[PDB]
Scaffold this motif. Structure first.
Motif, PDB file in Angstrom:
ATOM      1  N   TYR A   9       0.838  -1.188   0.000  1.00 47.57           N
ATOM      2  CA  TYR A   9       0.000   0.000   0.000  1.00 47.57           C
ATOM      3  C   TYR A   9       0.878   1.245   0.000  1.00 47.57           C
ATOM      4  N   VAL A  10       0.587   2.155  -0.927  1.00 48.97           N
ATOM      5  CA  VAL A  10       1.423   3.328  -1.182  1.00 48.97           C
ATOM      6  C   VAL A  10       0.694   4.547  -0.627  1.00 48.97           C
ATOM      7  N   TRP A  11       1.152   5.038   0.525  1.00 49.93           N
ATOM      8  CA  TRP A  11       0.569   6.247   1.096  1.00 49.93           C
ATOM      9  C   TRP A  11       1.012   7.487   0.328  1.00 49.93           C
ATOM     10  N   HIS A  92     -18.708   4.341   1.520  1.00 49.48           N
ATOM     11  CA  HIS A  92     -18.619   3.419   0.394  1.00 49.48           C
ATOM     12  C   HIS A  92     -17.929   2.118   0.783  1.00 49.48           C
ATOM     13  N   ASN A  93     -16.848   2.200   1.561  1.00 54.10           N
ATOM     14  CA  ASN A  93     -16.131   0.999   1.967  1.00 54.10           C
ATOM     15  C   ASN A  93     -16.896   0.171   2.989  1.00 54.10           C
ATOM     16  N   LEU A  94     -17.732   0.800   3.816  1.00 54.20           N
ATOM     17  CA  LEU A  94     -18.476   0.059   4.824  1.00 54.20           C
ATOM     18  C   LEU A  94     -19.658  -0.702   4.239  1.00 54.20           C
ATOM     19  N   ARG A  95     -20.152  -0.304   3.062  1.00 58.76           N
ATOM     20  CA  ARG A  95     -21.195  -1.081   2.402  1.00 58.76           C
ATOM     21  C   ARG A  95     -20.690  -2.436   1.935  1.00 58.76           C
ATOM     22  N   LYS A  96     -19.420  -2.528   1.532  1.00 56.07           N
ATOM     23  CA  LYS A  96     -18.877  -3.807   1.094  1.00 56.07           C
ATOM     24  C   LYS A  96     -18.892  -4.832   2.219  1.00 56.07           C
ATOM     25  N   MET A  97     -18.780  -4.380   3.468  1.00 56.94           N
ATOM     26  CA  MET A  97     -18.791  -5.296   4.597  1.00 56.94           C
ATOM     27  C   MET A  97     -20.182  -5.844   4.882  1.00 56.94           C
TER      28      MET A  97
HETATM   29  N1  LIG Z   1      -3.507   5.516   0.307  1.00 56.96           N
HETATM   30  C1  LIG Z   1      -3.907   4.230  -0.258  1.00 56.96           C
HETATM   31  N2  LIG Z   1      -5.245   3.707  -0.013  1.00 56.96           N
HETATM   32  C2  LIG Z   1      -5.551   2.525  -0.559  1.00 56.96           C
HETATM   33  C3  LIG Z   1      -4.712   1.782  -1.316  1.00 56.96           C
HETATM   34  N3  LIG Z   1      -5.422   0.663  -1.660  1.00 56.96           N
HETATM   35  C4  LIG Z   1      -6.658   0.588  -1.204  1.00 56.96           C
HETATM   36  N4  LIG Z   1      -6.743   1.747  -0.517  1.00 56.96           N
HETATM   37  C5  LIG Z   1      -7.927   2.149   0.190  1.00 56.96           C
HETATM   38  O1  LIG Z   1      -8.547   0.996   0.812  1.00 56.96           O
HETATM   39  C6  LIG Z   1      -9.841   0.767   0.199  1.00 56.96           C
HETATM   40  C7  LIG Z   1      -9.957  -0.659  -0.269  1.00 56.96           C
HETATM   41  O2  LIG Z   1     -11.135  -0.776  -1.077  1.00 56.96           O
HETATM   42  P1  LIG Z   1     -11.009  -1.460  -2.612  1.00 56.96           P
HETATM   43  O3  LIG Z   1     -10.947  -2.933  -2.548  1.00 56.96           O
HETATM   44  O4  LIG Z   1      -9.718  -1.147  -3.227  1.00 56.96           O
HETATM   45  O5  LIG Z   1     -12.275  -0.941  -3.569  1.00 56.96           O
HETATM   46  P2  LIG Z   1     -12.130   0.226  -4.739  1.00 56.96           P
HETATM   47  O6  LIG Z   1     -11.941   1.572  -4.218  1.00 56.96           O
HETATM   48  O7  LIG Z   1     -13.295   0.337  -5.616  1.00 56.96           O
HETATM   49  O8  LIG Z   1     -11.007   0.026  -5.647  1.00 56.96           O
HETATM   50  C8  LIG Z   1      -9.935   1.690  -0.986  1.00 56.96           C
HETATM   51  O9  LIG Z   1     -11.267   2.279  -1.065  1.00 56.96           O
HETATM   52  C9  LIG Z   1      -8.940   2.728  -0.769  1.00 56.96           C
HETATM   53  O10 LIG Z   1      -9.561   3.882  -0.192  1.00 56.96           O
HETATM   54  C10 LIG Z   1      -3.383   2.160  -1.638  1.00 56.96           C
HETATM   55  O11 LIG Z   1      -2.560   1.330  -2.439  1.00 56.96           O
HETATM   56  N5  LIG Z   1      -2.904   3.410  -1.125  1.00 56.96           N
END
Ligand SMILES: Nc1nc2c(ncn2[C@@H]2O[C@H](COP(=O)(O)OP(=O)(O)O)[C@@H](O)[C@H]2O)c(=O)[nH]1
Ligand SMILES: [Mg+2]
Length: 199
Positions: A9-11, A92-97
């Motif tokens: 994961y790239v911040w 958006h992310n909490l709906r997936k759960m």
């Molecule tokens: N800063 C950062 N956030 C990430 C990274 N990957 C995932 N995330 C976060 O973690 C969440 C994981 O959800 P995800 O499976 O990727 O669904 P998506 O947003 O539609 O692609 C994402 O919505 C991102 O906000 C990353 O490589 N760098």
RNA sequence: AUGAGGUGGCAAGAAAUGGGCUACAUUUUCUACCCCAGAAAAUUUAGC
């Protein structure tokens, strides 16, 4: 420290979390730099939903006031336009759960009209609070009804308050006071607690 | 002509007193709701 990521994961260009690092690091990156806090939450969910499927641990998703996810928001853009709940990454992310596309855990939720947006005071049923979209998302699901105190529960709660000396009025421990409290609250736990608070 | 018209001009300042119009908030304000939520920040005139 036991749970570990499976991706890099790239911040930012300078900082990244490498594969195999403990999940706590991710949490720390969200706690130290707030700019990446929201991105840090989703990753955690993304990990917890995945690893639980592998069988590493059992996961509980406890969402209180779940009806907010598929409703309306009172957040505005700079052009005073309305923002939909799906436009928020945290929502958006909490709906997936909430989707039952993973195993190794249980999803428990509780509705709430208190603090809800654009809902009448007396709406408490699942469809009324959730909306069509919310019902479609949660469906299929098991609803569980929570009601007012039955006489046994009401008597036991009043005995608990009396054991804590929380009812100071001289007529409260008597029977007439108990009938009056029962009628005024109608065995509703919250109304009974509020009434007993100032007696 | 106490009737009808043309031309130009007429712009005002001071206090002492009386009244009227506005906002004046924490028991408040904004949103959801229409009441179990979240955020912000002495004189004197009338009436009963
Ligand atoms: N800063 C950062 N956030 C990430 C990274 N990957 C995932 N995330 C976060 O973690 C969440 C994981 O959800 P995800 O499976 O990727 O669904 P998506 O947003 O539609 O692609 C994402 O919505 C991102 O906000 C990353 O490589 N760098
Ligand atoms: Mg003049």
């Amino acid at each position: 420290n036991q749970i570990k990521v499976q991706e890099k994961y790239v911040w930012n260009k300078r900082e990244s979390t490498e594969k195999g690092s403990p999940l706590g690091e991710v949490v720390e990156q969200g706690i130290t730099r707030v700019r990446n806090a929201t991105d840090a939450v989703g990753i955690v969910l993304k990990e917890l939903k995945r690893q639980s499927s592998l069988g590493m641990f059992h996961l509980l998703v406890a969402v209180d006031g779940i009806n907010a996810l598929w409703g309306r928001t009172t957040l505005k853009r700079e052009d005073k336009s309305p923002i939909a709940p799906e436009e928020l990454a945290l929502v958006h992310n909490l709906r997936k759960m909430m989707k039952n596309d993973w195993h190794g855990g249980a999803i428990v939720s509780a509705l709430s009209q208190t603090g809800s947006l654009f809902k009448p005071r007396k709406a408490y049923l699942p469809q009324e609070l959730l909306g069509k979209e919310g019902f479609d998302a949660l469906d299929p699901f098991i609803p569980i009804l929570v009601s007012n105190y039955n006489p046994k529960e009401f008597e036991s709660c009043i005995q608990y308050y009396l054991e804590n000396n929380w009812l100071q009025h001289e007529k409260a421990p008597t029977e007439e006071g108990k009938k009056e409290l029962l009628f005024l609250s109608n065995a509703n736990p919250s109304l009974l607690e509020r009434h007993c608070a100032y007696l």
